[PDB]
Structure prediction request, 787 residues.
Amino acid sequence: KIVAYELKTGGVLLHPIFNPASHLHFSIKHPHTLSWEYYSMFQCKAHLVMRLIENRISMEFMLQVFNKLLSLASTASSQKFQSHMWSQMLVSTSGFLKSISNVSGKDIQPLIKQWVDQSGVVKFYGSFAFNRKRNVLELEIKQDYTSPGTQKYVGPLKVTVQELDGSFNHTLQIEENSLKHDIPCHSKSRRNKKKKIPLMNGEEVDMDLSAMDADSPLLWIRIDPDMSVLRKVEFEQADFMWQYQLRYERDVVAQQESILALEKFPTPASRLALTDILEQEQCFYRVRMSACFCLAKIANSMVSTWTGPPAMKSLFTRMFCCKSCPNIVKTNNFMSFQSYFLQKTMPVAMALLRDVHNLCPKEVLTFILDLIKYNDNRKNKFSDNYYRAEMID
Amino acid sequence: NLQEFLGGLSPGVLDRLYGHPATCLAVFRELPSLAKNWVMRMLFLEQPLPQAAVALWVKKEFSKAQEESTGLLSGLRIWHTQLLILNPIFRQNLRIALLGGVPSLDKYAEERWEVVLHFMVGSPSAAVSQDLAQLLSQAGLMKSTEPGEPPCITSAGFQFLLLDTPAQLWYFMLQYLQTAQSRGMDLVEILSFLFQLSFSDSLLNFLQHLREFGLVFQRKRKSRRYYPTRLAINQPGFIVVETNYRLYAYTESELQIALIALFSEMLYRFPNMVVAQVTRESVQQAIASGITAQQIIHFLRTRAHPVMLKQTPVLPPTITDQIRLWELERDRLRFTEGVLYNQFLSQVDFELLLAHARELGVLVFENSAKRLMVVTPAGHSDVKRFWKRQKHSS
Prediction:
């Protein structure tokens, strides 16, 4: 939301100094002259910058800062002196930074100078190349700092590389003149023997390594995984790396960004990846709800190649319909709250299917109308208004 | 073949090459079967005729002969559709060609070719001729790299050596013509003389080279008249092969003994016989030098003593199979120049890039499973631009 708004119009400036922001058509000196979208993005950027301050100075020290502010205010709140002490209930920026420096011993003045006083987000364009001879991974990260909403980042940058030997984090120093970052790569001895490949968490899984390159061990790369800067990343992986990142990652933001990047690769391996995500309980439900729409877009792009039925129809009849009647939907029992959301989002994406004539097929429209006719809600303890409203959608 | 040589020519050189004296007859004799008949038919016609007649003028059976003859003579451009009348110049020359307008020599040719082959091989005693040496060096079968030291023999040299005399001489003359064009000698004038044989400064030099090769011999202190030898127009065996890789060759000329020693170990040399052994060492030595088992087998078969001709096959299966297996035992490294890309993103997009390097001729190896295309540095400035254009198209 904030990178869309700041690249759209100028930027949000937390803590201006009194104009400080002349790129935008109102004055930021008073709350009653702000646009309402600017007020909403102001609150949004403020809580993300506080998450960044928690990233630099750990969460227990952050809660100690907040407790110190509240305790000064509550010793202030019981005095009777007319504001000799009632102004300890008012916080400022300098007092907040001083309380942070009191509890931690680190000051955050570079982070405050970059993300508060400066009003911009950063844009990262990354592309890699694997050097087989020296066994290194040559990243190439360049910033677009000449757009109207952007600024230049010179700090450190975390990158997480999943190779066959596991998941390794690397810190890159991205100075102004930097372009190529050579990080080292590990072995490929988990392709010699079939062993399980260890993940970002402690677990390990069986991966189908037939799509991987023979010479490179690395399975996927993620630039800034923890969202530790206010950034927009445009990484150029290969399509099998996006499919491996969709399947076997233990991070929901990486599964979402792989869904978002698989729309450019309409190959049938990506259809298999999104269909395996859709069938998979123990995936987070908002990833499967995105995989519905991604599968609809991919299915629209590979018409005159699609083999069987329309997308997600057989999957809907496998998950939510009767075993004896495929075209009759099961009676509504909405007590699971994840297959309820997936059931009410799957025909909405299924209706975006189009034939070679650019008209929605009469197999999906008839399916949606049979979902509407055979709807029986006399048996669940929950209402049907959102599911029926999504059927109209 | 001569058909290949003449097919590899332009119309402008072809019509000029169709000289009055002989060319119209020498090229006629090339016509394998039927095109002779059609040439005779429409030798007397001044009016072109429709192609359908020629098409239907051969029965349904054996039509492939009709199409192949028509294609061959279309390549030779003997006629033109003109809408199939023959070329007027060829018609006139052919009408003028059709009722219009030694024992010591063969030995000389044999001896001259034998001494030429002796020089080709590392024979201490051989005929000396700087022009012949440089001609053989530039023919592609010899490389010197050091004028002071005598030139060595390249890999193609051994293969050329093991060929039979007819094909050997024919290929040598083909290379002679190809290098004649490079050195600037007119190709048509020299070529017409070869055709005239089977019935200027450049002419004198060419005849001198032919005499050095032994095809012709003036015999009169280099007079205008010449008496071509048998080889100019265009024998029993002596080797006996045992089942224990033993060769008994009734050879008196050192050339045959040298040729056998090229791929066999010599044991004894009698006045009218020589004993050699075909061992792994000798055979693999020849294979490394460049020969392949096919040349050795063909050489032994062609120089097969009459005694072993009765048995079928002439060459024992054990010897032939052993030679072939010995050659197979060796498989060898290669050399090329290339550059490789990576991170090709979409699959259907990588298939379009494969056709760019294949049409230009800079593609070496492709990989659709990993997306891995090797591009030679000679055309690197053209593939990258195409890739950039594709990216721009998105």
Q: What stands out?
A: DSSP finds 13 helices and nine strands in chain A. Residues 36-56 of chain A form the longest helix (21 residues). The CA atoms of residues 196 and 206 of chain A lie 5 Å apart. The longest strand of chain A covers residues 122-131.
